[PDB]
Every structure is written in structure tokens, then in C-alpha cells.
Design a protein around this nucleic acid. Structure first.
Lengths: 177, 136, 116, 45, 75, 50
RNA sequence: GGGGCUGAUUCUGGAUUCGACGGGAUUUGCGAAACCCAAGGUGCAUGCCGAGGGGCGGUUGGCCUCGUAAAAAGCCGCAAAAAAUAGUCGC
RNA sequence: UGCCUGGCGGCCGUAGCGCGGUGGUCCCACCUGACCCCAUGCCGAACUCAGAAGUGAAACGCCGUAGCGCCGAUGGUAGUGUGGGGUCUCCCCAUGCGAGAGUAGGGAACUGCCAGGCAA
RNA sequence: UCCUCCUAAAGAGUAACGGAGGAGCACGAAGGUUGGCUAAUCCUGGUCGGACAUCAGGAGGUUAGUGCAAUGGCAUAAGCCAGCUUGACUGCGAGCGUGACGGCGCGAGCAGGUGCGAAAGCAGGUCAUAGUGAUCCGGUGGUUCUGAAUGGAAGGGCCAUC
RNA sequence: CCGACUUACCAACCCGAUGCAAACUGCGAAUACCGGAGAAUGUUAUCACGGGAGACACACGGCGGGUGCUAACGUCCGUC
């Protein structure tokens, strides 16, 4: 509940002074992140998924979540109902401190950092990004891990337009290079 | 020559040709030849009718064909008995109702278009005539 | 929406209640209220309607629409129903899951003397 | 929201080794001492 | 290469509207659900609508999606 | 066809059995179903039989 | 004229031409083609014109050039363009 | 009684969409708070409870709106029951039945009960 | 031989060496119940990943799915997942549908016995329509029902079944 | 080579317009067939049970079609 208290009063009046919200229910709120690590190559071997989940294993509360294939694809060598990816639906209250673990301290851990894009939207105004690796998180020490495992990190706010989701990222010092 | 691209059924029934035209009058161009008799036109008849009609103006304007065969009509081989299966396809006729505008031309003098379809009328089997562009 | 999507779940019970033509016991759950009605098999007339919305019934509790307040009107409705001589209803889920308050509404209606 | 399959947690207190302290609840394990903070991340110059 | 076919199943309607039939008498033989159950009408294993009790067979269309119904009024 | 026919004899005192077919190539273990016994007029288990 | 069988060793499904070459991206370093912001450089320039073009004629319908007119580039045919480009054997 | 709301229906696209407005007293929704009731191939998103500070944003309801869907004659038209006829692979006439689409138009509903709130 | 569409002329039905396709199985779960849920396919964005994984948001509307061919239907889902079970139960069966006949089909409900749900309720197989052979002969288990002078037996009957 | 311009046209998906379908139907007749009510008329014309048969080679004409060449005193079904 660290940055939500900064969201609770300072950001809220910052929003209605920015876009003239007549109601306190139209100012956007972050609601979830999707910390999804779609490794993919684990179609032949199980442990390519199991350690990928175990390299994913230190963000949210508990064990690591498995996913399934949507359908069967010849080119990607898959059949229907196949354990391929591992994801996270970090919605609610346990996710707000994760941003400070990501948007503040994992930012200066990137190999040759320059910045993140500001033109990546779902059409409605919720930003999706994908980190190239996972080593920037504090939980990985490069001792027992073995991969440069990347993972899509999509933040979904209640922004009615594309600029507002850019602005709701901009209200919490996002690195717009 | 006209033939249905990627058709559905190879063999269909003979069928009857009853009724009048569900295509009313001049729509595309400005002058049309409307079939009066009732019957059918082979796809061989259409192209030779298209060839000689276009021969009059030689390039000028465009000629709007309002019809299409879309009907495989079969024939048994010569000197084989009745039945023994269904005959295979030979050629593709178009079921033609009375009062159906066959070909439409635009971009010609009025009198030149008269013989342009009249020479196309001799190639075509059924008796037919000329019509002008309809008003409303 | 969770309300209109709930309705199609209730329809299977609602189709069944009129297909076999039995008097039903309907529920409706509000954040601060609870509702309970008894509706005739003709499907357009409501016989017994006892909810917490009425001003003479809500003031028995502090917060209406919780478990003890839901049981406050569950006991009352069958008392009004048995005062019409009603002895057969089947409980309708109305799409609501039979675990929480709408179970506790049904618990008091079982306590009032009706059989379901 | 549900029980028991969301990648593991453990509260630690951290402090970056540049005079800037970022001590929030984390999920690393026992602890970790950081090296670079946001305030020393060279995006300003 | 063709000519192989089946013997027909004698589907379709067995009793028309207004006809009075006893319980257990089959109303409509059908494959899908072209006529749905109204009152006193049950669907069998193969959607065989049967007269559940005494009365007269009535055809009607109701429902949000306009589904046809066979119903029985006890006369 | 590969589902050859088996027998489901009762653990009850009867010699009676249910008769059905299983795919013994795919499902190697025997079947255990508590059906209704007619002679006992009770529910008892059934194991596979040949 | 018809029927059957055979129709890339798999004859019913999971190619891994171990290889330059052809397609795609990935990663790397940065290029007006992988680029923009006049600012760090920085005072006398650009476009319309006039002009003619390595030995030749032309040549980007635009380029090294011309402060109102006789000299200069990439390149086209020109042309220093190659040739038993594996053997072995003959007269 | 009226205005509303909520619940259950009759009819079920004249009843539905899109877009223009409105409502928070009440009700409803959003909402907050979550060990415990309980929920979960995951994180109180849904489901669940506890509350009700904030809100009418959104949903929903009503008002506007034919920008569309939708209903839609009359006459004519196609077909056809017979009865005859024709230059009888197709038509005509007598009577009898009568579209589909299209056209003028209509259309953004109505309806039944029950409980609350506010005005009389 | 069986199944589905059309030929077939709007009740059903209806032929030709007419037009087209499928079956000689699959499933103890892909069954039963309760709970819960809804697709196709696009483009928007996002690490390898791009056109195809995984993830998010919108369009969209069942063009999806339904063991398998077509037809009919299906979100109240008959589609999809989870939970617990074996109703894939026995003895009947008012009632009809259907073929000359043999034969086949649907069936609430009654008795006994079970599962699901709290409950009305549902279940005597799979969304439906093919996935199959009459009798004789003999096999196997159960049953004294009979059992040739009698005690039994053998052998038959019956019931289950090959 | 740059590389711009242009072009009959090859030319998708969306828009509007135009025709065809036994295996296309968001639309939809005549008649057909079933049920009920009624009256006139008909030597019960309705059906059941029993005794007896013959018949199961059809033909053309009419309309509805398959097939054929909408050829056949052709063939195969419907119906009179």
C-alpha cells in the first residue's frame, strides 16, 4: 500500500486538474498487471516449462501458475491443451508494491538502458510492454538460474483513451525516452 | 467463353424453363438487346455473339453481358445404350426467359448500336429485339 | 455485468418451475437489503411479498442485508404464506449461489414452518 | 481472487548501496542489498 | 458409383392441432427440436414429443427467439 | 472393431453378471462398478469376468 | 475402348536434404535510407534562370561546373573482354 | 392517486440497435473493508461476507434521436384449384384462391401485479 | 445390408445401372447429476515470436463446437470445465408410432434399489438418426422346473449368456 | 542502376447495383392430407371376423418430374 497512498490524494487531484473529470469515478485506476512468461519451447520437454515457472516463481504469493495452449498449430509443433506458458494475474492489493520493485529499482538494472516506448496500446488505453529478460528483478541472483527469460508485462488501467493510459503511466515517473 | 469458376455440382437435373425474366430492363449501359423468345443459349453461342457484336465498334465502349451459363448440361456418348450411369458434361447453357436483356452497350452512336446488336441477333438462336435505356 | 448474465442461469430454474408448474420462492440480493417473494403458478401474480425494504421491517436491525437481517424476513414470509394456508413451495436460487445470505434466508423460511 | 498458485513471496527490507534507501516489502527471500537506485539512474543528464 | 440410400424413417407430424389424444400418444416425430415442449409435452430420447396427459394438442409459437410449442389443454 | 466383450460378475452370492464391452488394450485394469443386483435387490460391487 | 493394381520404403499422419544458396526475424554497431531537432560549427548561400558536360556521342530529366557564360562527373555502346578454367587420350 | 425505483411476468424486434440528454432524497449500480462463511487447475476480477465514507464515471432506467433494423397495405404482378381452349418443350380464357419482394406509410412500444421512497 | 440429403410434385410414403455422400465402430469415460462458464476469426499492443504460440484490450457474433457423413437442432446450451457418482439398475409398463410378417421405436408412471443437489428434480447410456444378422446346433454359469421302477444322476426345460 | 511518372488492366476485402440454383431460404401460395362441428343426399357407401379367389407382364392420354437429345408408340416414379 505504498504508492496507492500517493495515488489516493496527490494523483487524483492531479488527474482532474489535467483532464477536467467532473466525477471521481472517471479518473483512471490501475487494476492489474499481466506478468506472463510465454517460454514456448517447452513443447518437447517438461522441465523447460517447470524451471521457467520456477524462474518466474518469486513475484506474487505462492506456487507458479501454469497455462495451456489455445489450439493446435503445426508450425509451432503443438497440440490442443498443452502446458506451454506461465502467467500472472496480479490484480488487487498485493500488486501495488511490485511497481516500486519494477518501475523504480529494476529500471536501473537493464543492460545498457535507454528507455521504454510510449506508443504501445491496446486501442483503449492500457499499456503492454515486454521486458527482454528477467535478471533486473531483485529476486534473481545469477547463481541457480540459467536463462535470459523474457516476459510480457501488461498493465491494465481504467483509461477511456490512449493518452490517459499514457498519462496514468506518466503520473508515476515512467521512463518515456 | 464463359464457365463457372469452382462450381459446386458436376451434374444437375434438366429442369424446366417456365416464367418470365427476373431481370427487368436496361441497368448498366444505355442500349440493350432483350430476348423475346424462350429457350437457352450455349456458352459457344454467347462468345460468337459477343465477338461479332464487338466487331462492329472494334474496341469502342464496353459491352455488358447480363447473363451467364451456370448450368452443366450433359450428353451420353455416341452409340451407347440408355442409362448405365449419368452422362458427363459437354457444354454450359443459360436458361433464358422472355423479356431478358442479354447484352448492354454504352458509348456509341444510336444507329451504329442498332446493327451492333442486330448482327448479334443473327448469331443468337432466339428471336429478339432492341430496347433503349428505361426512364425511371 | 453480473446481473443480467445471472438471469440466464436463473431461467433454467425458472423454466423448470413453470414447466412442472410449482409455486416458487424467489430471492434477490442487494448490498444493503435482501428480498423474498412467493409468486403464484400463473406466472404473473405475486402472492406473498415480504422483504426488508418496508420501513416497518428494516428498523429491527442496524444494517439490513446481512445474514441475521436476511433471516429476519425469511421467518416472516412463510408466516405470511402459511396465513394464506400455503404448504408447498420449492426454493428458487434466482441465479444466486445457495451458500451465503440466500441460504440464510432459506434457513429462516425452513424455521417458520414451510417445507422445501 | 484465489488460492496457492501465484509466484512466491517473502518480505525483505532492502537498501541500495549509494546512500539512497528503498526499503519496501519484497518477495526475494531473506534480503538483498541493491547497487543502483532510481535517483542515481543516469536519465537526467 | 451411386444409388446407395436408406429406407425413410416416416418422420414429421402425427397429430394436428385441436386433436384430442390420450397420455403417451406420440405427437411429432422429429430429428432436431423444430417443435419445443410447451405444457404437458415431454421430449423423449430422440426428441419425440409425446402427449403426457389427456387433452387436445395445440400448436403455438412463444419465447424470446420465437420457438414453436406443442401444448395440451385438458378437455 | 477392437472393444471385445467382457463380463462383470458380482461380489454377491449370485452367479449373475452384467455383460458389457471394454477396451482392454487401452484400459488395462479391471472395471469396478456398484450396480444394482437383482437377486440380492441390493447394491454390490462388480469385478471383471471372462 | 473399360476394370484392377502399381504411383518417391513406411503400404494411415509428427522430415531432422548434418551443409552454400533463397525467405524471415533475432542480436550487434551505427549509417538521410536504418533520421530528425538551427543548435555545437557557421557568412556571405539556395532555388528559378543562362550554361555545358572524363578520348568520343550521350548520360541521374538530374549531377563535380558556370553570378549570366566556356571548361569540368557516376555511367551507356567505345574500350587493356575472357578463354583447354574436370580429367585422361590423339596427329 | 401521481411520480419513480425494484421484483416477477404477458407479448415477444412498431417491442432492437447506434447516437443526442438525465437521474443518486429513495432505490439501484459502482464503492470501501476483508482473518473469519465461502470462493478458486492463479491474485477477495467473478463468486462470498462485512459494511455502507465517496460516486452517478460506468451499468441501468427514462427523455431525445428513423442514422439503421423492424411492421407495412391498396392496386398490379408470379403461381394455381378446377372448367375448357391454343400455332400444346409453353401459354390463353372462364371462374376460385393469392403472394414474395417493392411502393405510400408506420415505427423509437404497450401490458399485468407486488413492495418501498417522494408529492397530494 | 444399414444411415443422411435430393430426385419427391409443402401430410407420411414413393422408382431408374438417377444425383451426392457415410457405417460393420468409438466412450467406464467422451456416462449420470449438481455447480460454473461461453465461441469463430480479425486487427491494437506486447521479449525471443515474425504470418502461427503464450498475454492483454476491443471489434465480432456462434461464420465455433457437438467421437465420425450429411441433415435437423442445440447458450435454458445438446458446447465447455470443475465436483461427487455409476441410472451404462432390475421387475414392469397405461399409451401410441411404425413394417405384409418377423421385427423396431418413443413413453410419463408403478414396485424395489442407487447417485447428485439443501430442495423440488434428473438419471433404467452418449444431441438425434448407421456402428448389424433370424433359426438350428452346441458351449459356460445359475436354477430340482422336470428328470421315464425308485434314490439320485445323465439329459432336457428355464434364466443369464457365448 | 537510380528511379519517378503512367497504364489497357491482373486486382482483394467493404460499399451500391445485376442475374442463377434439386442437394441456397431471412420470405411464402393454390391445392393436398388430418381433426372437430353441421345439413342434405347414398340400396352400410365405414370397418371388423370368417370361407373363397384371382392378381404381383401393364398400356396409352393428362398433369408433376427423373433420365434421353425436355428424340422416341423410350424408360422409370407420382397422380387422375
Amino acid at each position: 500500500a505504498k504508492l496507492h497512498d500517493y495515488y489516493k490524494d496527490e494523483v487524483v487531484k492531479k488527474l482532474m486538474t489535467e483532464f477536467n473529470y467532473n466525477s471521481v469515478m472517471q479518473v483512471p485506476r490501475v487494476e492489474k498487471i499481466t506478468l506472463n512468461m510465454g517460454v514456448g519451447e517447452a513443447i518437447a520437454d517438461k522441465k523447460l516449462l517447470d524451471n521457467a515457472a520456477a524462474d518466474l516463481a518469486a513475484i506474487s504469493g505462492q506456487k507458479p501458475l501454469i497455462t495451456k495452449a489455445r489450439k493446435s498449430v503445426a508450425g509451432f509443433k503443438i497440440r490442443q491443451g498443452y502446458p506451454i506458458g506461465c502467467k500472472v494475474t496480479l490484480r488487487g492489493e498485493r500488486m501495488w508494491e511490485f511497481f516500486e520493485r519494477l518501475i523504480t529499482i529494476a529500471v536501473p538494472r537493464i543492460r545498457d538502458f535507454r528507455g521504454l516506448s510510449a506508443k504501445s496500446f491496446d486501442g483503449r488505453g492500457n499499456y503492454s510492454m515486454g521486458v527482454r529478460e528477467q535478471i533486473i528483478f531483485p529476486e534473481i541472483d545469477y547463481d541457480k538460474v540459467d536463462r535470459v527469460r523474457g516476459l510480457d508485462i501488461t498493465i491494465t488501467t481504467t483509461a477511456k483513451s490512449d493518452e490517459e493510459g499514457r498519462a496514468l503511466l506518466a503520473a508515476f515517473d515512467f521512463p518515456f525516452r | 467463353m464463359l464457365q463457372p469458376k469452382r462450381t459446386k455440382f458436376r451434374k444437375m437435373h434438366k429442369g424446366r424453363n417456365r416464367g418470365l425474366a427476373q431481370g427487368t430492363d436496361v441497368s448498366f449501359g444505355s442500349f440493350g438487346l432483350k430476348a423475346v423468345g424462350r429457350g437457352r443459349l450455349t456458352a459457344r453461342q454467347i462468345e460468337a455473339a459477343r465477338r461479332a457484336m464487338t466487331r462492329a465498334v472494334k474496341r469502342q465502349g464496353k459491352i455488358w453481358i447480363r447473363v451467364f451459363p451456370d448450368k452443366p448440361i450433359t450428353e451420353k456418348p455416341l452409340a451407347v445404350r440408355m442409362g448405365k450411369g449419368k452422362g458427363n458434361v459437354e457444354y454450359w447453357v443459360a436458361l433464358i426467359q422472355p423479356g431478358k436483356v442479354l447484352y448492354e452497350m454504352d458509348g456509341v452512336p444510336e444507329e451504329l448500336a442498332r446493327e451492333a446488336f442486330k448482327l448479334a441477333a443473327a448469331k443468337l438462336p432466339i428471336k429478339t429485339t432492341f430496347v433503349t435505356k428505361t426512364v425511371m | 455485468d453480473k446481473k443480467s448474465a445471472r438471469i440466464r442461469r436463473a431461467t433454467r430454474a425458472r423454466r423448470k418451475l413453470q414447466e412442472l408448474g410449482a409455486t416458487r420462492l424467489v430471492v434477490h440480493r442487494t448490498p444493503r437489503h435482501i428480498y423474498a417473494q412467493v409468486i403464484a403458478p400463473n406466472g404473473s401474480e405475486v402472492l406473498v411479498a415480504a422483504s426488508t425494504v418496508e420501513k416497518a421491517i428494516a428498523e429491527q436491525l442496524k444494517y439490513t442485508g446481512n445474514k441475521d437481517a436476511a433471516a429476519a424476513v425469511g421467518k416472516a414470509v412463510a408466516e405470511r404464506a402459511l396465513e394464506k394456508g400455503i404448504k408447498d413451495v420449492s426454493f428458487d436460487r434466482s441465479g444466486f449461489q445457495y451458500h451465503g445470505r440466500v441460504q440464510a434466508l432459506a434457513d429462516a423460511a425452513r424455521e417458520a414452518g414451510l417445507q422445501f | 481472487m484465489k488460492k496457492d498458485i501465484h509466484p512466491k513471496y517473502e518480505e525483505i527490507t532492502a537498501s541500495c548501496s549509494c546512500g539512497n534507501v528503498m526499503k519496501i516489502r519484497s518477495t526475494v527471500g531473506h534480503d538483498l542489498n541493491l547497487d543502483v537506485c532510481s535517483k542515481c539512474h543516469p536519465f537526467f543528464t | 458409383r451411386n444409388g446407395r440410400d436408406s429406407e425413410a424413417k416416416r418422420l414429421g407430424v402425427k397429430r394436428f392441432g385441436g386433436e384430442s389424444v390420450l397420455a403417451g400418444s406420440i405427437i411429432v416425430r422429429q430429428r432436431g427440436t423444430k417443435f419445443h415442449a410447451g405444457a404437458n409435452v415431454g421430449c423423449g430420447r430422440d426428441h419425440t414429443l409425446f402427449a403426457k396427459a389427456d387433452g387436445k394438442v395445440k400448436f403455438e409459437v412463444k419465447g424470446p427467439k420465437n420457438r414453436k410449442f406443442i401444448s395440451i389443454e385438458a378437455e | 472393431g477392437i472393444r471385445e466383450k467382457i463380463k462383470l460378475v458380482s461380489s454377491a452370492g449370485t452367479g449373475h453378471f452384467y455383460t458389457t464391452t471394454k477396451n482392454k488394450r487401452t484400459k488395462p485394469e479391471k472395471l469396478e462398478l456398484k450396480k444394482f443386483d437383482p437377486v440380492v435387490r441390493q447394491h454390490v460391487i462388480y469385478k471383471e469376468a471372462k
